[PDB]
Amino acid sequence: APADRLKALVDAAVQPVMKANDIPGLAVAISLKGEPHYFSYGLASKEDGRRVTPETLFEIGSVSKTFTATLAGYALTQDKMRLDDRASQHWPALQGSRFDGISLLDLATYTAGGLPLQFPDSVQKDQAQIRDYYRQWQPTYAPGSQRLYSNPSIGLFGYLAARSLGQPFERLMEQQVFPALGLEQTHLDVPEAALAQYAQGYGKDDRPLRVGPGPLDAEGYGVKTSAADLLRFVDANLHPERLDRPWAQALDATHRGYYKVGDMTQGLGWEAYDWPISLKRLQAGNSTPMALQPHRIARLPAPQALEGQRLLNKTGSTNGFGAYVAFVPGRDLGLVILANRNYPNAERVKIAYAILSGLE
């Protein structure tokens, strides 16, 4: 009965949403009572007929920021940087710019003062162009006052964390972070030998879409991973004490909240809600206006532990993919939902909520 009921619950949550959003392929992984459960739907490629499995690689877009935050957590708990460091401490090229007056925490939590959603189209994947972009940028409002969700903000945070460790971001992720987490199906640059696992992404008129190079792409949206590997990462987040101490501390650093906007408490990468909360409130926290408009923050008197009766989550999208991850620390419960269409955040949350409600 238990296996039957779980399948029935996940199918009932997933199937209508896949149909309604014309999603070609979708992978679910759930961590429940210390065991993984996988549910795979549809096609990784409509053209060659490759089916989705728990090993299929999907682009996870901004969910990558939780990995970036974990690397920063490592730099922090290793005393190579502090959250109150000024940004220009870690890149001489930024000395004399406005980044003299902007903290690493500001960058990590999108409060540097109006860094935009994405780098402008004019900025290519080039160190000099990126350097010059930040050198010339001026805040719209005071650092530390308003949240504006931003790839160049947290991207710079990750880049500076790598500089503080004296190695390239991409190399640190491949050689240190992914292996520490036990992740062998997680990539910034998918090996040739693994390309058979890489799903096709689909956009308007089902044009094929896989993510191309861009400035600070690794830091902001670099990761391709499987539902199985992403759940392994969720399980590391649920039980950081199962990892060697330096990495346990790194994961813990991503479970600390610094301010609230409405119902959401902002950590490094992760965004947290009280649990239970209504589906409509969780959707609102993951909505377009939340991502696209500046919001005044309510700063906390001290960092808050993001644990117990809370839901931690992150959305992420590329042109052809849409990902969502959510977990409840106090219930040892986690889930990932990966798809090869960028479909509305509210629909991803709707699937997750149906699964979580059914388990409760």
Ligand X SMILES: *C(=O)[C@@H]1[C@H](NS(=O)(=O)O)CCN1C(=O)N[C@@H]1CCCNCC1
Query: Which residues are annotated as part of the binding site for a beta-lactam?
Result: 62, 118, 149, 151, 342
* Choice between 135 and 239, CB closer to Cl ion: 135
Smallest separation, CB 154 to Cl ion (Å): 10
For the residues of 239-265, what is the DSSP string, one character each?
-GGGS-HHHHHHHHTTSEEEEEETTEE
Tokens of 337: 């939902």
Mark 137-166 as b/e (b = at least 16 C-beta within 10 Å): bebeeebbebbbbbbbbbbbbbbbbbbbbe
Residue 320 touches which member of ligand X, Cl ion, none, C-beta under 5-8 Å by kind: none
Sequence-distant (6+) residues with CB within 8 A of 187 are 57, 174, 194, 223, 224, 225
Residues 33-62 that bind ligand X (CB under 6 A): 61-62
* Choice between 284 and 291, CB closer to ligand X: 291
Residue 316 touches which member of ligand X, Cl ion, none, C-beta under 5-8 Å by kind: ligand X
**Catalytic site includes residue 62:** yes
Note whether 319 binds Cl ion by CB under 5 A. Answer: no
Ordered strands of the 186-187 beta sheet: 58-59, 224-225, 186-187
Stretch that binds Cl ion, among 47-55, 119-127, 194-202, 343-351 (CB under 5 A): 119-127
Helix axes 151-165, 64-77, angle to 10 degrees: 40
Ordered strands of the 256-261 beta sheet: 35-42, 25-32, 333-339, 321-328, 310-318, 271-274, 264-266, 256-261, 298-305
From candidates 32, 190, 211, 243, binder to ligand X by CB under 6 A: 211
Nearest to 70 by CA among 189, 223, 265, 184: 223
Helix, strand, coil % (nearest 5) of the chain?
Answer: 45, 20, 35
* Choice between 266 and 318, CB closer to ligand X: 318
From candidates 39, 119, 157, 159, binder to Cl ion by CB under 5 A: 119
Smallest separation, CB 249 to Cl ion (Å): 29
From candidates 41, 74, 178, 221, binder to ligand X by CB under 6 A: 221
- Cβ–Cβ contacts within 10 Å for residue 261, how many? 18
From candidates 315, 327, 348, 350, binder to ligand X by CB under 6 A: 315
Residue 158 touches which member of Cl ion, ligand X, none, C-beta under 5-8 Å by kind: none
Helix axes 227-238, 245-252, angle to 10 degrees: 90
CA angle 73, 77, 80 (to 5 degrees): 95
Residues 138-197 that bind Cl ion (CB under 5 A): 151
| Binding-site residue ranges | 62, 118, 149, 151, 342
Note whether 220 binds ligand X by CB under 6 A. Answer: yes
Residue with the shortest CB distance to ligand X: 62
* Choice between 115 and 355, CB closer to Cl ion: 115
Note whether 279 binds ligand X by CB under 6 A. Answer: no
3-state secondary structure of 337: strand
Give me the residues that bind Cl ion (CB under 5 A), please.
118-119, 151
Give me the residues that bind ligand X (CB under 6 A), please.
61-62, 118, 149, 151, 211, 214, 220-221, 291, 315-318, 345
User: Which residues are known catalytic residues?
Assistant: 62, 149
